[PDB]
Amino acid sequence: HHVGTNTGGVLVITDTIIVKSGQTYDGKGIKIIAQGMGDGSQSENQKPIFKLEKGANLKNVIIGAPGCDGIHCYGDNVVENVVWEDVGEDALTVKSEGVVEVIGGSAKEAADAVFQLNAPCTFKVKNFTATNIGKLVAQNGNTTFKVVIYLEDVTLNNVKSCVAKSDSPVSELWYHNLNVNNCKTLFEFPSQSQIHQY
Ligand SMILES: O=C(O)[C@H]1O[C@H](O)[C@H](O)[C@@H](O)[C@H]1O
Ligand SMILES: [Ca+2]
Ligand SMILES: [Ca+2]
Ligand SMILES: [Ca+2]
Ligand SMILES: [Ca+2]
DSSP states (O other): OOOOOOOOEEEESOOOOOOOOTTTTEEEEEEEOOSSSOOSSOOOOOOOEEOTTOOOEEEEEEEOOOOOTOOOOOOOOEEEEEEEEEEESSSEOOOSEEEEEESSOEEEOOOOEEEEEEEEEEEEEEEEEEEEEEEEEEEETTOSSSSSEEEEEEEEEEEEEEEEEEOOOOEEEEEEEEEEEEEEEEEESOGGGGGEEO
């Protein structure tokens, strides 16, 4: 496990990092601390640490407290080996349509949702651990567009509300090698038949 060459460095930022289409931001293990962008509370007007435009990728960062409004993803994004040490309002939001994959990494201390889906998308969480969270995935409340969520090799500990919540009857959640400890209720969807294994 060659840890990255920026490991032990801390980057203090005062504005959102914008990653453009076709660009990959590779932090090489850098820890990011945002200043002036939010306190990581549940206040809904914090800034994102990263804005990933459509077709942008992000890898190998640690997001330190304050988690602010985390990572905004505008579709067709891969987010690989990102560690949220203390999730802010949420960890990652899907803001526009496309495929978004979170592969590797982990999240801890989400007072409410880790992943927030606000546009129709295909959303995959793979090889991921999260501890002390309200929900792993939430589709924006009272919306009825379609998301399809895949949880593959995911381990969850201490889930206060549920693994995933959606108010959309057309949305679907598919899981494969999902391990959950200390969780209220697994899935808050209009019908449990929207949830499938594979
Ligand atoms: O964090 C977010 O994306 C969301 O959080 C809340 O659910 C809010 O009601 C939404 O409109 C959106 O702001
Ligand atoms: Ca929110
Ligand atoms: Ca937190
Ligand atoms: Ca948010
Ligand atoms: Ca919230």
